[PDB]
């Protein structure tokens, strides 16, 4: 099969191929047949008298584990698990996200770029606001958030966004939230040999973990993030690997941090860098994302993005990556040895992500201007080492239009409100063309790359197929990276693949039919959206001709963002099948008994055409439910 | 294969065979020969991308997974991950104990019986307690030990027996512990595909994880439930499955969390459940208990112990057994199965652990008396439905005396102290036998059973070889109920195995050879004992002719405690093999390079005189070290 459906990717696997290298897809053809009992998830190894792998087909061969554990059992814990990773990646971003705001000062480098923002922001958290230092709100705010994390007695602190029914189904279903690392442990505890034996109290605990992820962890990072960076507006940006420069330091931005990222953007315009990188024959400084981080720098300052996560390696093939500086998460460790074969400088900076024989470089929060400049000036040092006669970058970029935070969406639908009736700055722009029907609805389309999927074609086939039927698409991550290389992210795409209604819709508000709502954590930006819809019509979340769709998604993260997007009552369809097929009862809970639950349930389909048409259905179902 | 050196498990595992009924042996057999790749830990499922499996061997087959990773790198987030769990399970068990003693009152189920020992807690987390109200004192040290859990901000609190020299090498070496529930979150961050691929760090991180069990969690867990229940002191009681009574009805209190137990404890001396024991036809009510619930109610109250982990099954098998009630961790599922073929009321009562096809009756917090005497009333009640046919009990119990606290420890040293030179109520007289010479060291054998291991062999092999040589043996958990069932905590045992000086110790202090100290997380205990020894005589706890043993380990608890047994500077020394050998930089950290980190390292032994020799040897070496 191929391995793409991005000609600059092909481009550049022949010349991986040429140069002797092994990419991921080069990987996975070694890694051949793979276990079938860890594929259904069948196969355990919570304690040392395993491993143990029971029969994905019931009543065959071995039926339990030597604790005596089922199928059911051992899926769910496995599943619950991916979970509590997932969660904990994101709580991770988070937390250090709120520790920076708690470190903010008027003459510091990290300062308060939003004031209404966090205003806004206090509003939510209970702090006080009128006649106070904005530094001393932020750093009240930023306690409120931290207690989020680790308070053992109280309640947590969730969005107003978040509807008052949907809050009473969690506390009356026993998934109502704790503190984030609190549930996380829990899951942790109840997955421990000789705990938790029963699948549905098993997946209930992972759904009340993920939505600690959902609506705190991501939730305050994103919203902190906009505090301190600047909320994201309209903006035009550039996409896939032709964004790289021959002729200038190319520094590329891999992982999902975005305190790093946005102190190298302002590195990059440090009069001392830029002499040093013309005085190594450079025209300029070349600064290009990947991933989440590009994501962000890209919704706030335009950066570039040179690929997303099955892109990274192919990236150092080019030859003309002097610096490749990475952060944490979906950083494949096989670049390490990939930059050996090139003059890359392979730059780690922090202490939760190191990775053998790549260059280590801390970066040092207490000063981070200072510390984002010298690993800076490492990379652009490493111009020298060039060789340009090992450098191939395809002439294949694509304009892309990105930065739609909740708050530019509000804007851009100001434009279509009459000024006679009002009111101004509400989502009942939106509300009103979904509740007429000419728009049948919105779909949220994120998640990774994954080699078993032909890459980026499973979400360009996805959001085109819903934007055809009328779906409005908002995309983050990984997803929004492929449909912004494709050039979906561009206001002619109305003309040339919505359907009559979205393309009508486009041309009224002049928006793309495609919504880059930015990075990983800012799926919670699409959640704070369906929120205001469903507040503005008084009705819970799971009422809503809503979806999201991850086609072809590989990390633990993924598998959190589904189960609180599921949880949070907005059905999920996964275009990678989750190692659950070898238990039947946890099967029959996500795709069946969920919607019992919280009105919402997981779809596990592998054909993006099947899957788009199962969305407008499903879709059209809750329209009549809701009488629209 | 023998099964098991224990004769009553003997008799119960034929009654088991002539009943058609299958056991932990019978489910261990039929999953035959294990998976090598996961035996090896060289078997990764981190994300969908994923299964994947490398070469336990270095430089044959498939070398790396698809991200990249190393077996290194599989290997060492493969043990990071059951850190974290092990650290999880004893962390949910201190938080709920921390959360009981926040609700302790003077006229509720719940009070203070050791105002003393609060009192020296509350000093050692800076809570005022002159002229204070007992119960202020108990919840402001309550919400200290809970802000341990999950402060983001500050430092956390660690006992005062832990060396300022221990927490400025954790320090410099980057160890030092965090809240736990963000330890836990930070290790499962860290393990998340692509971002930490570097052995080194990742046993670091999980090290730094383990710190939080075993001195914050399990410590705070072993004292809370000291101050809430009574410090518990030498006190006999029976062991094995004999003490079931055949005439009475049969309560088998199984789990860890010691709340319910202690209100099951008191409920059966309540005068309408004892009348109604009588009227359902039986004696009277009989409490006995398993694994650490047994544990700690035999510490305080003399309650016997019918048996440990590999026993629980056994228990069902006498056809004896009215209720068995369970609130968390080492609970074999298969039990709900096998209560099926006898009367047996298998009870669930905590909400962390729902087993399928058990009786749940949640275990009220709010009301822990009337919830247990409900729950108590279910098993007596249970009683009318005995066959009296089915019952076999083995005439095999044994006496044991136990109730070894620190405290108590101290106390017995008193003896021994003379009254004109002094001091008295210190470890003096301990550290004097050891510096002397009299004591070559001190040995903890602490851990699980396991089907790979003869059930118990290990233990008591190990137990009788160090105390032969003149070693002073303190246990734990399941090894402590091996010795009691073996007959190891009796007095006379000081003459049947001890060595000379061992021996004459016992005889002037007037104790057995061997030292119940309690639970798994009583080994908490044991780091107290040990640091106090290193604060009197000035050095580390790494300078010490001191070590643990896990002879028969099976859990993930087992994995962290080992794991902060060494990070605390005290060698350790595993009788089952973890699955690690696929990755040799991970094996090399593990038994090599941690004695340069830490002062002590692993040693992997599946020979128990083979351990012994090595421990002696190794106690030896460390004492010519020390001078003495
Ligand atoms: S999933 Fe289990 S059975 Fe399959 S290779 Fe991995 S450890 Fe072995
Ligand atoms: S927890 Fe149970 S099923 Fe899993 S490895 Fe241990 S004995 Fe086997
Ligand atoms: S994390 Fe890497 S090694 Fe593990 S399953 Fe995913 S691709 Fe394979």
Redesign the interface.
Known sequence: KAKSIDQATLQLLDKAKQDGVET?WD??A??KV??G???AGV?C?????????VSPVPGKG?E???????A??IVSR?FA?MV???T??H??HG?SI??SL?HTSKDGDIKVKDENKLKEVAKSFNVETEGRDIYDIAHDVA?EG??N?????GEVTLPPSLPEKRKELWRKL?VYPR????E???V???????????????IKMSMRCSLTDGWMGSFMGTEFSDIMFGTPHSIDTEANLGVLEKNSVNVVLHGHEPLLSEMVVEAASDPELVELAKSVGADGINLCGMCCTGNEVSMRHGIKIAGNFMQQELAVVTGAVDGLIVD??????????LSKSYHTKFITTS??????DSIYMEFDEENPLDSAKKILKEAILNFKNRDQSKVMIPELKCKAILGYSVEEIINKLDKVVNTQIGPMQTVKPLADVLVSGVLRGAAAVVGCN???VVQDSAHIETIKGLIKNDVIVVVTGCAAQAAAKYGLLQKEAAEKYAGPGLATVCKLVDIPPVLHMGSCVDISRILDLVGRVANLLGVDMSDLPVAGVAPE???????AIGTYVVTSGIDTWLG?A??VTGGPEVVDILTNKMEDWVGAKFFIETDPHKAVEQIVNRMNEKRKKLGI
């Not at 339990?64 to 089922?70: E, Q, S």
């Not at 998460?329 to 390490?336: K, V, W, Y």
């Not at 998604?553 to 598998?559: G, L, N, P, Q």
Request: hydrophobic share 40%; charged share 20%; proline share 6%.
């Open positions: 991921v990987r996975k070694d890694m793979q276990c009992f860890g594929s196969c190894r919570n304690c040392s008298m395993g491993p143990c792998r071995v339990r584990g030597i604790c005596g554990a089922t059911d059992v496995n698990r509590a990773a997932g904990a990646a709580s991770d937390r709120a520790l708690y306690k931290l207690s994390y680790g308070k053992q007695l026993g503190a984030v690392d609190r996380i442990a829990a942790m505890h109840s997955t421990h040999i000789g705990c938790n034996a029963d699948a549905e109290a098993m944490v998460q979906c950083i494949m460790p096989a670049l390490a040895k202490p939760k992500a190191h990775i053998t994954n080699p078993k998604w590989m990390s633990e993260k993924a598998v990678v989750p190692p």
